[PDB]
Write a protein that binds this ligand. Structure first.
Ligand SMILES: OC[C@H]1O[C@@H](c2cc(O)c(Cl)cc2O)[C@H](O)[C@@H](O)[C@@H]1O
Ligand SMILES: OC[C@H]1O[C@@H](c2cc(O)c(Cl)cc2O)[C@H](O)[C@@H](O)[C@@H]1O
Ligand SMILES: OC[C@H]1O[C@@H](c2cc(O)cc(Cl)c2O)[C@H](O)[C@@H](O)[C@@H]1O
Ligand SMILES: OC[C@H]1O[C@@H](c2cc(O)cc(Cl)c2O)[C@H](O)[C@@H](O)[C@@H]1O
Lengths: 813, 813
């Protein structure tokens, strides 16, 4: 049907059809009379997978023969989403499979909706890892993603009575056709025990053993025939584990204890929970990965060349134990001296920071590490002593600097600062957006920047234009390719050529048409799957992301209520119609976030059923926000809400997704928003609110929310409505905690940005009244979004951190 | 190479080779440079499996269209062993795959040794179910095996310092290519809760739900293109199971609790352990199976025809809850009246008893059933009341009969006698050998036989000649086929034609040659895999079976010691050389059985290292006895030890395996031994010891072991050796418990059969001195083993219990 989706050749379609029928018969053991739609999905999945294997084998054979420097990307999260459509896109199979299935009497889109998301991440950090894997394969890098194969990913969110309910994401229930178990590469991981010192150094003994079994998933590059590997570890008990009948039966049942390590993803985003099971997960991934790395390195004695052949990227502090584990292996097992081992470690490891929020920083209690990883604690202490000796020599007499920079934090409970460990043991440390990286050098890591300025870098985040344009928005990808060709898909900077079409009436009409089509289709989805009615002609105002106080869904709520109150005051006055969509998951233990979800639904209940409002304002909570839902709602959006308090969102990536898909942005100068506005031009962005400097000034003075309440009558009305029980008539005091936090304990200064936000929102509504100029501004956004391709980000990591040159050259098919 | 293994056609071998390479590439994602021998096994397994699927689909399509009466065989155990070779045998693919793999540079036998046993059973009862499935498919019966998919089967046995150590049988580690998960047929199973009474009968409410997910395994018939299904249930938690972060994480981890139901096989053979987890397993299999049965029946309202379309066979009392569960479904859910429901239940269900040992009888505490299955207890009480009302009318005034026949046993703890339940609710009750079935009518079920004589039947056990001749002993199958053709494989009675070859010198030589080849190969195995040296010219004296006091491995031990003592007394006297092999697993909590294993190894330690003995006597404990080991050792045996105390081994099946494979039998007149001796003629069997009547006479008098000790000097010497520490010099009192049990607490009268046993063993050694007459007696055994084919057994069940006619006709290929 459409050009960018590849060729549907006669020979190809015929071959796909016969292989589909083969899998249905031999693989699924069904025929067309008994087959369920899920059987049809699996038949297709297996058919597409067959096209990967040849390329997968020859890519790994290529790396063995050429022996390039290998990149190891260590992460506790890979938010992959669905794999079927992505694989077709990267292999140029989409139109062929579409034709083949059509001739078989099947609708491919319907089959695509059957695949479960691989939800092995919480949000931004997990999705970044997924985008990065795609870009690394597209840029021909010898890269491996290493993580944990969680049996249960991020929970499925159900809304009951306006409240979030969690249910287990049993994503492996029906099987996963994409993974390949590799039990032959099973490795032992050690826990607990004690340290013995001998003539030949230290020994870690009396340990409990857990097995790490790898599962490999192919990562295809974009039409370059490269297929890289994501290797995820699963926890397995050894067969003599804990080994009377009561005794025997119980010993077998106790195997669950060891295997619980890979059972479940911790569902916290941007929040540190110091639980032992989480620490076990962090060591488990690190210990198994490093053994696998060293094994592969030896199968090429001399560890001097290790940093020339290995790069390890630490995704946040979660895999920080890689540093003392590499030291442990090199010193204790390989018998290298400390200084040489440390040189290798530093040159091998690099660290990416993703946050400045104090509650998100990993600080593990010494007593935990003492019991679980006694040898690693000893290595950490020795690392600390030697590091502080350097600090003392560089800044003699500065005793407070020593205490500030220490990896060991003193107090009620002694803790290890994992961020401090990562800086000490890495040759590079980067933030994820220009303003974020500057904040790191100016504030939390200032002392470290003063000691080693060369170590500190910026790598602004990006998103993959394959999943986040071609896959989710084919209609937009097509109208673009009609004008400038297909080359932009792997060179997103080419979108700048679209600036010469900003006055082209044909193109303006096509951009607006594609958006309208996306909006209509998404409006149908909401009726079909959630029985909700929306006006497709209204402005689609959307904030989708995890529920957090810093992301200020509450500020959005205040604006929504303002619009409702202004309508009730002057009902017969014209307003630009809006559909306000807010979606996202709250961490199960985050009470305030759960209260915010309830508030949103409570507002919808009042607003959506007021006859006076009509279809001029609708408030909808998007249930179970996840990658597959993002792929639907993002192409349908007109307005992207990126309204975190300045200095709190390290980068954001959802912002970049909306920009690429034809939405305009209302946002603070926070994270990547600053660079987005710089690229598009500030006149083509709806910027409002305090800058980081203004937040700082307010904190020095003291933030007093009452001041805003006293001086803004519209704001006072909202607070009085919330307090009195307007949005909860049966439970008048339901929202007392929210009002209290806003009035007395608001770390994120919601009131302080309220006035500017509302006024900026008025400017949005005014522009939307003029479809032609709205669309022209949209075109200027899409055209300047090229910087935010993860291909650019990864090319920067490759050249400036890993010391490898990306390649766009095809491998033979 | 050999005829019975089928044709190796040019077109077939070429097709097998290309499909092998396809699977290696597309399925295993390997090439010939990286492939492990395990990859080669899996490539072959997948290749052979492909040939099953067409037949599997058309068999189940056939049953849908023809709608025959369906046989449901309910068992907690299916001891399947390996599947690859069995599948090749039944499909006539063995020579073709042998040729195909040879041309690929691979040894097929080596690949076959890589497959794990499916060890989902303990011994005789589990293996019987497996043999039965094979025969039901070979006889074209619409039959389904229903059980539990245990994650861990029977433990692997390791011998350390002469002691049994258990380790988890992680048989699914590498995956199981034979099974097909069917999550679409997932069914809910209820536990706990309470009973509410309404206007419309009783309701079972507030229950905990566990999901039952089926996995289907194909069961091929012998060259008839029939492929039946074994459906095994796996336990799964619902997604809202148990559904704060501590709270959230723990709730997910607690899913293990529900899923523990299918985790592990209880490793007791012939022994009742009244544990709650076992009760849950029994209900789980019953509840899911019955829903599946009724679903299939409705997909053909009127339950009058239910018994015409459904037969349920209960394998021992383990699935006895099928009776009250069928009543529950019919009465509570389908709203049938009690009397009509009961009529249907009785006509549907039949019960097979496998034991008379009191410790093996299932008697569940009322308090357990009250908490776990409150509605079923109510139904059981009502069944009991109505049954006892019939007893009271038939035998008026006989109050003690009422108490004896009651399903409810009074005492310290009230219990439900599950055997009594099964008789009441079944239209047929059978024992597993003629003497066993007579013992049932004369002793434990005498009252029930008096009430309903028509209900009681015999069905003598059998074994499948496919696995237990063609598969494990191709050389013997071939020399037989050369003389009488191939028809005997599915009509074992034809072996009688071999009686006309008992004086044929060519055949005599061939039978002896095949045995010698088997012995040599097995002697090599022991060196290669266990570093033990044996004389292949010695008599192979073997007792393989579970370790139990009733099976009297101890009596064997006494004979072994007697031979050793007689050699030490007259060293320069000639004796027929023997290799005594004893193997089998002990239940983990069975202390005495574990002591017997230690005794056997202790005897070996002394005997095997005495220079005076030389290679005239060797004692070897066969580690980890299981189906795959049985297939090796049984064809290599000369003498089969079947020496249980008369009246204790219900049938035995190992006995039949040895008879078919050219070993002579030394045995008591117990279980099937009686019928074996009757078939072959008593002169061709080495019978010794007390008959059942003699045991009874001894019990009436009082068994006094001291009498035998006082009157038999050879026996006295052995006991004094055991007591003084001759077989345990470092631990003189190690075997004190064994001596004590033998002297004071021997339920199985070991001493009473000692004299006759030793004298009978002398007659064996004498015959072995004359190879020609030994072999002629062997031929007379093999020739009369036809009765003990499970094809005969199943044909009898079909005609006399299930009311269906077996068929030998091919389905179209
Ligand atoms: O984003 C994944 C897919 O979503 C599809 C898609 C988008 C929607 O807005 C709705 Cl409501 C349903 C749907 O299947 C798109 O049609 C398809 O082009 C895209 O590839
Ligand atoms: O019983 C299974 C298989 O056992 C094989 C077999 C028998 C043995 O005694 C030993 Cl030691 C090893 C072995 O692989 C037989 O050669 C083969 O004919 C048979 O099919
Ligand atoms: O770098 C990817 C994203 O990581 C986010 C992020 C930071 C963090 O410490 C933990 C998690 Cl789970 C996470 O998603 C940042 O908040 C966001 O600014 C950034 O865009
Ligand atoms: O019927 C098969 C076999 O079942 C055996 C048997 C009986 C029983 O109650 C429980 C188990 Cl696990 C078992 O294997 C009998 O002991 C044996 O005589 C018989 O040959």
């Amino acid at each position: 049907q459409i050009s960018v989706r590849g060729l549907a050749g006669v020979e190809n379609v015929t071959e796909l059809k016969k292989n589909f029928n083969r899998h249905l018969h031999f693989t699924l053991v069904k025929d067309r009379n008994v087959a369920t739609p899920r059987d049809y999905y699996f038949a297709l999945a297996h058919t597409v997978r067959d096209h990967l294997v040849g390329r997968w084998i020859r890519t790994q054979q290529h790396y063995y023969e050429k022996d390039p420097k290998r990149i190891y990307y260590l992460s506790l999260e890979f938010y992959m989403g669905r794999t079927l459509q992505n694989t077709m896109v990267n292999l140029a199979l989409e139109n062929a499979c579409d034709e083949a299935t059509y001739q078989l009497g099947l609708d491919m889109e319907e089959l695509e909706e059957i695949e479960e998301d691989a939800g092995l991440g919480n949000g931004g950090l997990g999705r970044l890892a997924a985008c990065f894997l795609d870009s690394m394969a597209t840029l021909g890098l010898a890269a491996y993603g290493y993580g944990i194969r969680y049996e249960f990913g991020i929970f499925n969110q159900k809304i009951c009575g306006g409240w979030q309910m969690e249910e287990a994401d049993d994503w492996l229930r029906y099987g996963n056709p994409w993974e390949k178990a590799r039990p032959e590469f099973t490795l032992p991981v050690h826990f607990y025990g004690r340290v013995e010192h001998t003539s030949q150094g230290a020994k870690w003994v009396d340990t409990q053993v857990v097995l790490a079994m790898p599962y490999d998933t192919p990562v295809p590059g974009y039409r370059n025939n490269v297929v890289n590997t994501m290797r995820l570890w699963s926890a397995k008990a050894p067969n003599d584990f804990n080994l009377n009948v009561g005794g025997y039966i119980q010993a077998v049942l106790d195997r669950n204890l060891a295997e619980n390590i890979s059972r479940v993803l911790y569902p916290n985003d941007n929040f540190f929970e110091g639980k032992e099971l989480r620490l076990k997960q962090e060591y488990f991934v690190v210990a198994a990965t490093l053994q696998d790395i060293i094994r592969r390195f030896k199968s090429s004695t001399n560890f001097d060349a290790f940093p020339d052949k290995v790069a390890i990227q630490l995704n946040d502090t979660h895999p920080s134990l890689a540093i003392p584990e590499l030291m442990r292996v090199l010193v204790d097992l390989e018998r290298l001296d400390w200084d040489k081992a440390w040189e290798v470690t530093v040159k091998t490891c690099a660290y990416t920071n993703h946050t400045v929020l104090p509650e998100a920083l990993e600080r593990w209690p010494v007593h935990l590490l003492e019991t679980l990883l006694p040898r690693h604690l000893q290595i950490i202490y020795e690392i600390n002593q030697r590091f502080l000796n350097r600090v003392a020599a560089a800044f003699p007499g500065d005793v407070d600097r020593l205490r500030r920079m220490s990896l060991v934090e003193e107090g009620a409970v002694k803790r290890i600062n994992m961020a401090h460990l990562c800086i000490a043991g890495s040759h590079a440390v980067n933030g994820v957006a220009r303003i974020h990286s500057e904040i790191l050098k100016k504030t939390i890591f200032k002392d470290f920047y003063e000691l080693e300025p060369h170590k500190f870098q910026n790598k602004t985040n990006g998103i993959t234009p394959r999943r986040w344009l071609v896959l989710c928005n084919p209609g937009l990808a097509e109208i673009i390719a009609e004008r400038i060709g297909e080359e932009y898909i792997s060179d997103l900077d080419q979108l700048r050529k679209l600036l010469s079409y900003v006055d082209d009436e044909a193109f303006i009409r096509d951009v607006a048409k594609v958006k309208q089509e996306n909006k209509l289709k998404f409006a149908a989805y909401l009726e079909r799957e959630y029985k909700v009615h929306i006006n497709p002609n209204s402005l689609f105002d959307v904030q989708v992301k995890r529920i957090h106080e810093y992301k200020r869904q509450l500020l959005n709520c205040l604006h929504v209520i303002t619009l409702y109150n202004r309508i009730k005051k002057e009902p017969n006055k014209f307003v630009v119609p809006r559909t306000v969509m807010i979606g996202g998951k709250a961490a199960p233990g985050y009470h305030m976030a759960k209260m915010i979800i309830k508030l949103i639904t409570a507002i919808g209940d009042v607003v959506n059923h007021d006859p006076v409002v009509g279809d001029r304002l609708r408030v909808i909570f998007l249930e179970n926000y996840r990658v597959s839902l993002a792929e639907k709602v993002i192409p349908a959006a007109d307005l992207s809400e990126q309204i975190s308090t300045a200095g709190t969102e390290a980068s954001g990536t959802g912002n970049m997704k909306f920009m690429l898909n034809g939405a305009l942005t209302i946002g603070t100068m926070d994270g990547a928003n600053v660079e987005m506005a710089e690229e598009a031009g500030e006149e083509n962005f709806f910027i409002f609110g305090m800058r980081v400097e203004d937040v700082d000034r307010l904190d020095q003075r003291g933030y007093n929310a009452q001041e805003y309440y006293d001086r803004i009558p519209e704001l006072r009305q909202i607070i009085e409505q919330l307090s009195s029980g307007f949005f909860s008539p049966k439970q008048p005091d339901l929202f007392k905690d929210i009002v209290n936090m806003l009035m007395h304990h608001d770390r994120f200064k919601v009131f302080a940005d309220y006035e500017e936000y509302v006024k900026c929102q008025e400017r949005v509504s005014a522009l939307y009244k003029n479809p032609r100029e709205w669309t022209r501004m949209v075109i200027r956004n899409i055209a300047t979004s090229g910087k935010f391709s993860s291909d650019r980000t990864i090319a920067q990591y490759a050249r400036e951190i890993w010391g490898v040159e990306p390649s766009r050259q095809r491998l033979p098919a």
